[PDB]
Design a protein around this ligand. Sequence first.
Ligand SMILES: CNCc1cnn(-c2ccccc2)c1
Length: 168
Amino acid sequence: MTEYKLVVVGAVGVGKSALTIQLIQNHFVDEYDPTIEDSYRKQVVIDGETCLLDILDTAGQEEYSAMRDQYMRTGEGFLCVFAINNTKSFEDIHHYREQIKRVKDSEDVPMVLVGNKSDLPSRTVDTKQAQDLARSYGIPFIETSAKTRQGVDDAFYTLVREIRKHKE
Ligand SMILES: CNCc1cnn(-c2ccccc2)c1
């Protein structure tokens, strides 16, 4: 069984670990607990194919820039999670995109664009802009909602699907 080494990168205000816990024990945590180092492995059946999902959560602060670069090489799938309530994370995606290519040296790399906090009425990021931007990058965009649990499971499925596509 192949282990999929994925890294959940994001800024402060998106709630990265919130999605992970939903996949593990299906619990939506409201509190913001700053993670330092944790890896969650689980056996997920992707379209009938059981795969080992190794997802590591990162820090929202750019304090460990060197540490970020370290596992930026090992990370196969990059989760571009931004928040529609935080326009800053939207612009940060451009920075991460370039940084990823800077350590991968490839015009094509398994990546996914997902927007979280889509349950908040305070929308600062336009859905069209997010969709159009996704087309500009050429990656699938999944609307994720941690509160109503929408675009969560399907996001993981599409993720692995793209990885398999790029692979073979
Ligand atoms: C960096 N120390 C070894 C190690 C363990 N795990 N991963 C890892 C897991 C998922 C995605 C990317 C990397 C790296």
